[PDB]
């Protein structure tokens, strides 16, 4: 899905 | 006292370099060891190779190439003309390698001592110089970079986290588009960003280094710097808590944006340079802004690590070759006394074995 | 190496 | 094709 959450 | 030191190494115009060739497309500096400049003198295209250990004696050789990039450590030079890529050992007068691509290469760079990264309109490849290796595709480009000018490509130390950066004009500003790719997950993430670097950082109380991704962006909301761990922490490690801090632009710099980043793992600090020549220094651990000032009137368009000082070296449009690094005797008393931050001062003093926190 | 003054 | 002349 996503690599990073910021 | 100032926490950084600013040095001029060279003025390229003193070596007879035409200022029209002092620019992103014709001047490359893949490390602090060499500068290559593509020039046309009369009818003949040439490359001028400046050895930074012997700078008053540049060599000039005829070329028929649209781009030349020197290896970071050795006098081994990559050149290309359209789909033709060739690698030469200069001192052996030898054509090491040749490869014919099926797409033009719009951007390339050495990403290690032995690997060249190749960016086409559609994908990114790595090409190892070891043995009989040919280019291997790493990932397909994300549509968010379509039509961008590609300005950078970098990786983490283990080449498992890959980052492509382009820019374009949108709503009358220069907007950054980045593609972060995980080799292990085979997943990309589009991220608005202008300049970035990876770094290894070992948190106190962890047995293993964390791999951090740091990027700076001027977004519609304003400037921000992010420091975030990529990947799953090594077994046993605590995770690195992500940090995010403002990146300041003064009122007269309304069209400025970040253009370069280098991270010193000697001092665990982040150097950021902006398009219109401001230098910022941040703590890698906390993101805290340690220092800002102006180092160039002209844009600094290419940078590299400055190995001896673990700083940053760059060339500006005038052809000044300049470096910035931590002032090891001043940084701690600067943070204690000018920033009034004894907590950061004491941490950095013991973290990187710097003098000055004997008094806080 | 020439020491430079900052521009601000 | 030779992109660099080292002779």
Author numbering:
A (entry chain I): 1 to 6
B (entry chain A): 4 to 363
C (entry chain G): 3 to 10
D (entry chain E): 1 to 7
Text taken from the publication that reported this structure:
Clathrin mediates vesicular transport between post‐Golgi membranes in eukaryotes and is targeted to specific membranes by interactions with clathrin adaptor proteins. A total of 3 consensus clathrin‐binding peptide sequences have been identified and structural studies show that each binds distinct sites on the clathrin heavy chain N‐terminal domain (NTD). We have solved high‐resolution structures of NTD bound to peptide motifs from the cellular clathrin adaptors β2 adaptin and amphiphysin plus a putative viral clathrin adaptor, hepatitis D virus large antigen (HDAg‐L). Surprisingly, with each peptide we observe simultaneous peptide binding at multiple sites on NTD and viral peptides binding to the same sites as cellular peptides.
In addition, to aid comparison with previous biochemical studies, an extended amphiphysin CBM construct (termed Amph4T1) was used in which the clathrin‐binding motif is followed by the amino acids “LERPHRD” arising from the XhoI cloning site and subsequent vector‐derived nucleotides. In all the structures presented a peptide could be observed at the “clathrin box”, lying between blades 1 and 2 of the NTD β‐propeller fold (“clathrin box”). For the cellular peptides (AP2CBMpep, AmphCBMpep and Amph4T1pep) the binding is similar to that previously described, with the 3 leucine side chains of the CBM LΦxΦ[DE] consensus sequence occupying the hydrophobic pocket formed at the groove between the 2 blades. In addition to binding at the clathrin box, we observed significant binding of the cellular peptides (AP2CBMpep, AmphCBMpep and Amph4T1pep) at the “arrestin box”, which lies between blades 4 and 5 of the NTD β‐propeller fold (“arrestin box”). This peptide binding site overlaps with the region identified in the functional studies of Willox and Royle14 as the fourth and final clathrin adaptor binding site on NTD, and we thus henceforth refer to it as the “Royle box” In comparison to surrounding residues, peptides were generally less well‐ordered when bound at this site than when bound at the clathrin box.
